[PDB]
């Protein structure tokens, strides 16, 4: 059984980062070095494992998290980073065991006049716990005045559109990200290398 990684990396549609997609991988065999030797990835950073030693290890679960962010923000997808994305959208733990993979997707995810589709959370009353996901759209009450369900004075809709325009510089260009994490628990380790 080949693990269904091609459905993760080559999915036609990718999640907004605030509603990041998480796919559980199990009971299958995976060849990770083929990913490492792909030449289409402009980012491939692992933590707590070596990209080479991945094919000789087994785990209870592999998680594949995927989403779109802008190029300037790929650096926030790592343990111990700060910024709007790390704090409010997708947070990796300090002891993160896995790999962060990203690639420019300007050809697919930019649209002339702007892309409305991809969103990020700009306001939150607190930082996310690691691997926490928050899809709420309640108006952010920045002050003491009640918002009554509508943006306004000190009342902010919490999600913002990236507006990926094809002519942007790379830092403002969309990047598709896939984060693999590896979980070993007492339950059987069913996802293994070749």
């Amino acid at each position: 059984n080949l693990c269904p990684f091609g459905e993760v990396f080559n999915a036609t549609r990718f999640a907004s980062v605030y509603a990041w997609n998480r796919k559980r991988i199990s009971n299958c065999v995976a060849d990770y070095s083929v990913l490492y030797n792909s030449a289409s990835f402009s980012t491939f950073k692992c933590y707590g494992v070596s990209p080479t030693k991945l094919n000789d290890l087994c785990f209870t679960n592999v998680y594949a998290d995927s989403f779109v962010i802008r190029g300037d923000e790929v650096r926030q997808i790592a343990p111990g980073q700060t910024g709007k994305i790390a704090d409010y959208n997708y947070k990796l733990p300090d002891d993160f065991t896995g790999c962060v993979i990203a690639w420019n997707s300007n050809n697919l995810d930019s649209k002339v006049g702007g892309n409305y589709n991809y969103l990020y959370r700009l306001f939150r009353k607190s930082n996310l716990k690691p691997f926490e996901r928050d899809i709420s759209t309640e108006i952010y009450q920045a002050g003491s005045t009640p918002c009554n369900g509508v943006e306004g004075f000190n009342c902010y809709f919490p999600l913002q559109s990236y507006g990926f325009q094809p002519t942007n510089g790379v830092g403002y260009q969309p990047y598709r990200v896939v984060v693999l994490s590896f979980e070993l628990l007492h339950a059987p380790a069913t996802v293994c290398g070749p």
Epitope: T60, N61, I135, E183, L185, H186, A187
Partner: antibody, heavy 124, light 108 residues
């Protein structure tokens, strides 16, 4: 066989306190998120609270946030719900439930085994 | 909160009937939707998880389908042990929410 056994329910006065326990056997407790789900008399199912396997993440229904506290004791294979400032509408059978997947995450999963519940009756 | 509805609220059926009941989420929950079955005086039992996977020990006459907002539970030939109330539940986002249940009782 996996077993969950709730205790601690009884008749409390509005504003009172009560602690619920859930004793578990037959699986590696720490590998699994655990949940409290309650059922008002003649009503449907109502999710109350969760706690991840290592106890580091918890979540509450809005109706009980700030009044209830969930916690687990690995040494005693036990789950607790500390219920403060109880209201009449908290009256329900309280089930504890184990998440199906062994994982430190807590979303996108199912509750594969339920205890038979303990009755909480809040009345003046 | 993601609101879950179910239809019909109650259903009369006979042994051997084909039964289809539905569940709707107020917003997309992908396929992160579970079905539980509950009989009076007893705790719910997990029947279907992640929209279409049958729990161990659930027989093949049960199936589940749907992804996004609309889900269905189908029992191809209702058996006596299937008379019960059925609840759907979204796991996509906290707080978790349940549909209000569909009771399937015995036609006579």
């Amino acid at each position: 066989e996996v077993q969950l056994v709730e205790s601690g329910g009884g008749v409390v006065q509005p504003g009172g306190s009560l602690r619920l326990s859930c004793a578990v056997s037959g699986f590696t407790f720490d590998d699994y998120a655990m949940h409290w789900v309650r059922q008002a008399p003649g009503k449907g199912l109502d999710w109350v609270s969760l706690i991840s396997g290592d106890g580091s993440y918890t979540y509450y229904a809005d109706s009980v946030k700030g009044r209830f506290t969930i916690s687990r004791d690995s040494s005693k294979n036990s789950l607790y719900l500390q219920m403060n400032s109880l209201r009449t509408e908290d009256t329900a059978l309280y089930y504890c439930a184990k998440a199906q997947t062994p994982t430190l995450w807590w979303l996108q999963d199912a509750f594969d085994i339920w205890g038979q519940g303990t009755m909480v009756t809040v009345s003046s | 909160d993601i609101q879950m509805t179910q239809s019909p609220s109650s259903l009369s059926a006979s042994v051997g009937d084909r039964v289809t009941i539905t569940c709707r989420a107020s917003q997309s929950i992908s396929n992160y939707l579970n079905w539980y079955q509950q009989k009076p005086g007893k705790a719910p039992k997990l029947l279907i998880y992640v929209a279409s996977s049958l729990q161990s020990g659930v027989p093949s006459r049960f199936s589940g389908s749907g992804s996004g907002t609309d889900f269905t539970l189908t029992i191809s030939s209702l058996q006596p042990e299937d008379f019960a109330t059925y609840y759907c539940q979204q796991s996509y986002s906290t707080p978790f929410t349940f549909g209000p249940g569909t009771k399937v009782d015995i036609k006579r």
